[PDB]
Amino acid sequence: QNHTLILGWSDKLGSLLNQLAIANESLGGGTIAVMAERDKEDMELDIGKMEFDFKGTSVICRSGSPLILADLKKVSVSKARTIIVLAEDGNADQSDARALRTVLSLTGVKEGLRGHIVVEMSDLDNEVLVKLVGGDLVETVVAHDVIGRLMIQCARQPGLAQIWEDILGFENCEFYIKRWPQLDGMLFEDVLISFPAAIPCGIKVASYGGKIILNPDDSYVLQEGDEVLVIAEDDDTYAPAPLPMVRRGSLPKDFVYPKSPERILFCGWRRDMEDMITVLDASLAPDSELWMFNDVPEKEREKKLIDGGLDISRLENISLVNREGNAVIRRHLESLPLESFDSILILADESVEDSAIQADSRSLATLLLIRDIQARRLPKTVIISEILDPRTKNLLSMSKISDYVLSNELVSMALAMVAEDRQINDVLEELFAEEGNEMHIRQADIYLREGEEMSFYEIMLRARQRREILIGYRLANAERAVINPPAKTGRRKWSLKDVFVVITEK
Amino acid sequence: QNHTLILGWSDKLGSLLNQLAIANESLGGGTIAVMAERDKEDMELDIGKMEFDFKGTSVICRSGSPLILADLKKVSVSKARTIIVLAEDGNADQSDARALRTVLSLTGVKEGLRGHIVVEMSDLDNEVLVKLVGGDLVETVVAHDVIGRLMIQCARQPGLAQIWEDILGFENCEFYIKRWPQLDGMLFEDVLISFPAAIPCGIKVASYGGKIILNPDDSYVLQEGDEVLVIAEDDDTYAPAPLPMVRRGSLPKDFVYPKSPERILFCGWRRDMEDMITVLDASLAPDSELWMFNDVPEKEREKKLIDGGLDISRLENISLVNREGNAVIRRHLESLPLESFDSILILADESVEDSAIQADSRSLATLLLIRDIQARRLPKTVIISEILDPRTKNLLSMSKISDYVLSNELVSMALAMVAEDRQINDVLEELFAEEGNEMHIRQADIYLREGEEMSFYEIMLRARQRREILIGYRLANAERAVINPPAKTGRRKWSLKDVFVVITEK
Amino acid sequence: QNHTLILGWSDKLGSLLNQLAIANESLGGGTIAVMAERDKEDMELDIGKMEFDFKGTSVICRSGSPLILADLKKVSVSKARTIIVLAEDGNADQSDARALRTVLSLTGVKEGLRGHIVVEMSDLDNEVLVKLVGGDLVETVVAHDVIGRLMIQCARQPGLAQIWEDILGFENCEFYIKRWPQLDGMLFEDVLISFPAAIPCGIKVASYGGKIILNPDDSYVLQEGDEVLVIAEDDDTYAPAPLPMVRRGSLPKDFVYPKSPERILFCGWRRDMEDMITVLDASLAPDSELWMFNDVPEKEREKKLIDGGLDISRLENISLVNREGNAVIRRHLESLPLESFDSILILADESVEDSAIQADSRSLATLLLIRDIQARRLKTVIISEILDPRTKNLLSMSKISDYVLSNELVSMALAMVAEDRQINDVLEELFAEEGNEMHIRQADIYLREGEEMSFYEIMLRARQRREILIGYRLANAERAVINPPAKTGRRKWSLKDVFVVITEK
Amino acid sequence: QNHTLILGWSDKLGSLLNQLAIANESLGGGTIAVMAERDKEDMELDIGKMEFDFKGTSVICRSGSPLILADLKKVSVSKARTIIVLAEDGNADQSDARALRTVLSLTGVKEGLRGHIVVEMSDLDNEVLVKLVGGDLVETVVAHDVIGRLMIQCARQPGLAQIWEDILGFENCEFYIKRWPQLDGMLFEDVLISFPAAIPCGIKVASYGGKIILNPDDSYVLQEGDEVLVIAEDDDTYAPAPLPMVRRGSLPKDFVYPKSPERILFCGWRRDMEDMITVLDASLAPDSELWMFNDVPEKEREKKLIDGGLDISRLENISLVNREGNAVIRRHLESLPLESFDSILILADESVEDSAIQADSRSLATLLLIRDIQARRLPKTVIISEILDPRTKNLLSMSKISDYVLSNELVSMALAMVAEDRQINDVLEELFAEEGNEMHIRQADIYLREGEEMSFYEIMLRARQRREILIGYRLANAERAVINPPAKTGRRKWSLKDVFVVITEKE
């Protein structure tokens, strides 16, 4: 029926539904079939009570185990254009085992499948497994590690959460891949300035066989059958135009990059800490500090690390220190240089991670503790927290300076994007993983000196000197940010200091 | 409309409902909406099985979570004159977390609120967070800890429980605040005897922006706009009168009597009992002893108690004695020297703190076993027991057993009062806290000599020589104390065995 | 509208219902209401799952708690002829505390109570509390620890369980108390033989305010208003008759008193098992051994017993041996010297005392395993505590492997006290070790071999020992006979016969 | 009515139903009644969601307990041809107790029983109990231990699982017991070659009341009333034939017996694992080591082993190595030397043995992780996995086959067999227990020299010199082994790489 099928049930589904509906809003009616081992009464009730509208969308809730070929016959599995396996609310091993079993069951359909499979997993190690047993039809979104992986992106550099919400979220922007016959033999330095209403930053290469290369080298001009990856409000924006001239300038280069403090605190025993400590060794070089709030004996945690294969003898860019305490009792958090942490991270821990109601509660509690204790300790740092619940992610109501909670809706949004164009998975898997490209903002001192009047494209070419494709600007105002504006590529007026959003390599 | 809204469902709801109805009885009726994550039909059934009369007040049951904005719209939260966030019965931290998120969701209303929020919190540590989140329009009531504090007071000064019940309860003589334009420029010590049908306690000074000072110095001169805080029968029952001619005189009898080391027993282990321990240390004379008969093993007792943040090292004039056993097994209780304890406090154990009637059954068994052992082993001890139930509502028992005991009804009453007039909570706080003023029962010889004939106003004027406000008396052979007596100008001959209940500084 | 009301729900509900139904058939029917915190439809299903006959009695199920007045009013508590508060499953002290709360709530009824309250209680000490709140209205049936005592009693009197089943149950026979103005002025020793169809046990003395003296003196002269307590078949089957001619034989010979150090095994941990230990210590000769095979760790057991308030030094006859293991593992049972035990008691464990069938499964496994091990490796008395009499019925055609007894007896007891509350006193005195108790005695105590005499003459011989002869079990009879029909007629008696007597301590 | 009745409901039920359906195809159809304490509508839904064809057999779903006589009479237990009491969802000791109470209730039926009772047991000790109350009418199938022993056997001779599957399953090969008046007075060693379309295994001796010896001595001379036990396709497919002239060869070579000390890995903790340990200790050569990777703490392991009656000191050929970790966590699995193990046994953990799919899911993850670590760490180890929803678990879409896995379906098959012909249980009881004789896969060089041209009957007669009954072969390049070959008198160029399937004495 060319419909979207979802298997299982979790806190994420809600936001996922919204995302998908938004998509189908641009292409007419939408049909999503959700099936799980639950009452058809129970599912439809929760569906009807959601806080957002399903523009031109219907949700068909059915009771059945994804492991039974007949229950999959009921949901037109062999006809769905996408099959989204959701992670089980609870223990991650149970969720991953059931996910592998559901993918096996999906392979077991004798006729075949019209679409692909989008699996939400909870560990990096098990990912490989699914790709072995589902092969072609399978795309895996490692949810847990991905959220912990962009937690450091939003924490190191404050204000990056809403950027991912607007890019991944189908409302404002999303990734599009379009074949433009005009620009085949065009220099990539000329291609990125060939689009006004969008910003091209990726390239599919026929000679690599549809492989998408992010941040290609400027001087590579492409084949006739090639597709460019741009970002815009909708799939149809104004591109390409005649090449506008830019003031080709020079970087006031600040070779030293001298102050890179990045004393960073973790206030959680996250289920995979080796993952976060390893992704974070791409931050800096000068004795990058890293503090771990354990709640667990330290001799135990060194074994926890060697379990993940992580070596203290190997980590090149940070040498970390360990402190033990508790995150709901106040005097333990008291004895910390909270005022000397460029970032504080309030995680949900191994213990009580399955409990959606209590880990998030501990997170909110620690946030309130830190703000109040510091407000009485003085005679401004950055804080970010992890909230598992979608209801509590919706509890964004406080618009103050510390309101950085990362919805796991991002994962949902990811599951939505891959559900629509699986190619984009291969781009998220690169923009998330630290190797290869990554989204940084304000990477180098003085792209901009002394209040210049340079246009956005002049800066794109100025910063391409450091393998950087430029994406967005902010203003001196807070709680606002705009990404790839359609109005004016070339301009004379704009803010003074370092409101700069980029893809780079580090 | 202006209706009372209650979010959640606990054992204290019925009592609360009762008080609310009493309050609305003066208005000819009222409206209460109750919303919880329960079935509507079952909620209405439970309302039907409650034995009191609603007195023209209607209770409406709606099934919803206070975290969804739509359910809040279903119960007209924006129109409600007051919101009462009850605490769930299961876990102190679980109810505290639910309350924190409920206050957050009530802030999440886009249209705003019309009334104020009264939040029942089950722990002092988590309370501060909700105070911070609520800010301008939130009042917090500390439940478990207030019960703990009041029990020791009633144990040392017997009969205070019924006094608190009558004063807090709307059944008679609740706190009223009214502006009297006639009374202005009069010193407060004359303003107190200016009301024949009411007893003035404190003053809300308009010059101080409206903070209610309790037990002010007599020199205070009334200002324009200032209002009176008084104890009276009903809203239209009290009115000022010309000052009655009254003997000022001087009856200080100043020959003081030293204190005496006392012996106290704690039955069962109570959650947050460390606060009770500290309060009892501050309350007793040097060289006093506290016995603790708890099922918690002696090894875990010191950890679990110091885990509560109690430095035994800061102990001043208490000695600790530990005993292990079940509070309902008679053979365990006979092992203790019950006759040697100056006071006994039967506490609802932390192990069964959740269940109301399941815990109060164990407490009642303990009481009956203690009294039967004191009767049979003998060839008079004051005993106060923690009750939560409608069990006390029966009150089959007679006075010889001190079956008068502290109840959860106090909590309900407090909630209702703060739902009617906000500031009252602050009042109660200083009254319940050791700081500021507090209620006391004092012997008659403190204020008068034996067989001395005088009137109530003269007694009040004599108490004022101690910065104390006379609120009432209990005669020698009277069961119940009398609060706000009617015959204030008329003489009675007072007995050395009589007692007086006064608001006094510390 | 007078009818029986039951508050709570336990496994004993079905059996109790059966007994009540038996009682009400003579009146053409009756009514029983059951109220607990359960679904009405599901309770009605549970009623449907009961295999016995209601005999014109209707059972009403209502969903409500016995603590709210509205639920009690839905079940017409003020009009009810009797209230039966079961001890709902869970923690024994918690169930007894809830029984105290239920009694307190029943006192709160504004309109008052027509009938009396029957309280199922587990702990013996708390009983007075329930009386304190209940006063006149309350009858407490504390049978768990006395049942434990009775198991030990059966280990020396192998058939006593069925005797208790027949007496407590309304089917075979029952205690009846009635006023016969005819017998006024008669010595009791004549009242005993004055009933052909019944055996008089006690007297309700009006001069004593209504107290029932059990096993009264023969010299007692009946006064006006006194009533007779008898064991009889039914209410209208017994009536006094002229005295039968009976030979006063007066020929009991005093024999050699048999005493022997015994070896006993206790399988599984029983609630308040320290009480059973204390009862057994008084029962055995010195240098005797009590073995205890429990899953409870050997280390934790001494604490668990001293919490029960049992000192080991002062009890002296028995010596204790402790062993740890599971009663359902055949290997663990092989670890015990099963062949050496004079008696073995499979006890329903405290962990599964609530659940009927889960407890009886372990008990059945343990019994069959012990029997098979005694068969594979080589007289042993074996008693088994069962909680579903349907288990003893599923066992059928007399397999003869066990002497068995159930907690279902408690239901019977409750039923008795629900009909005639006076009878409770009787029960008390018989179940406690103090005062009177029922016993099975050998024939040689009362007669010589092949002596030809009638039941009445043996009964008088027993009166020479301050005991009321109530029945006999012949040598080759499985079922013992209570209140025999042929009392006046001669018979030849064998030493292998046994007699059932109510005797003082 | 003579319908089949099943008391209880477990995960292995559907498979069992399938087997019954196959059998009832031979009779033109059948009827199966299922009674359990579950919803009727849900039970019929589960039946409707079963993917196989019932072949004219009708399934009836009723909600009731086998402990109430009224439900048993609602399902016509007295008229039933066979009763099958399944065990499910409880500690092995609790579910066996449910079965014991069920058998007692079935004895309690006053009107009597038309058929016999087949009782699935989870513990070996309890069997006699089920006998004692049941006596003649009960046949006991000791389920869990059967799979446990069979896994260890398959690890040392790979592919034995499919052999057991085919022989127990009614599809390709069944045991038949039939009387042939023609073969009277004939030596058993001649009765062996008398059937062209069938392989004679045992004899039903009338002199012993019908007890059947499965490997009679060659000298045994058949008596009147005796019946023959054979492996055949169907009841009407095999018949006796005149004796073929066959070369009475001699055994090729007697060898030095060399025993190589082996290395075994146990993933997950299995109920009664001490039994697997002791069997393997009896099976292996000295100086061998057994690794055990389960989440149960090593401290608790000593208790869990000693209550099962395992003394570590009494082991005489095996030394124990203990390792702790989660079987679905890759990093824990990397800690073990996976490449060095002569055999690996992925066991469904006791913690999830009740739950059907959770155990095989964890097992599948563990298997794929072990294989992937073996792949990614490199400059031919035997691997067996316990699976419980097998037909679906053996993926059939990507031409993908699991590594010699073992199934819970075997239990269903066994039950079905004993439900159809009760006598067969004796066979199973002797074949599945290590006592008496048992099935084995044996290398070819024991029986012949390389490139020797001879027929199946001649190899079988060679095997008879070692008290072994040759029942089949697996060729060198064969995915499946051949049981009851069709051309038995005919020659073939046998390679040493071939293997033979034989019923042999223990020693």
Numbering used by the authors:
A (entry chain A), B (entry chain C): 320 to 698, 726 to 852
C (entry chain B): 320 to 697, 726 to 852
D (entry chain D): 320 to 698, 726 to 853
List sentences quoted exactly from the publication behind this structure:
Two DMI1 homologs, named POLLUX and CASTOR, were identified in L. japonicus and both of them are required to initiate symbiosis. To address these fundamental issues that define the primary function of these channels and their role in the symbiotic process, we performed functional characterization of the LjCASTOR channel and demonstrate that it functions as a Ca2+-regulated Ca2+ channel rather than as a K+ channel as previously proposed. We also determined the high-resolution crystal structure of the ligand-binding soluble domain of LjCASTOR and reveal that the entire soluble domain consists of two tandem RCK domains that assemble into a tetrameric gating ring where Ca2+ can bind and regulate the channel. Our high-resolution structure reveals multiple Ca2+-binding sites in the RCK gating ring and provides structural insights into Ca2+-regulated gating of CASTOR.
To reveal if Ca2+ binding induces a similar conformational change in CASTOR, we also crystallized the apo form of CASTOR gating ring with the presence of 1 mM ethylene glycol-bis(β-aminoethyl ether)-N,N,N′,N′-tetraacetic acid (EGTA). Compared to the Ca2+-bound form, CASTOR gating ring is biochemically less stable in the absence of Ca2+ as demonstrated by the broader and less symmetrical protein elution peak on a gel-filtration column. The obtained crystals diffracted to a much lower resolution and the final structure was determined to 3.3 Å. In comparison to the Ca2+-bound state, the structural change between apo and Ca2+-bound subunits mainly involves rigid body movement of the N-lobe of RCK1, causing alterations in relative orientations between the subdomains. In the Ca2+-bound state, the N-lobe of RCK1 is tightened to the rest of the protein via two Ca2+-mediated interactions at cluster I and cluster II sites, respectively. Both interactions are missing in the apo state and consequently the RCK1 N-lobe has more freedom to undergo rigid body movement: at cluster I site, the RCK1 N-lobe slides apart from the RCK2 N-lobe; at the cluster II site, the RCK1 N-lobe swings away from the C-terminal subdomain, resulting in a slightly enlarged cleft between the two. In the context of gating ring, however, there is no significant change in the ring size of CASTOR with or without Ca2+. The two diagonal distances of the asymmetrical apo ring (between the Cα of Thr 323) are about 61 and 66 Å, respectively, whereas the equivalent distance is 62 Å in the symmetrical Ca2+-bound gating ring.
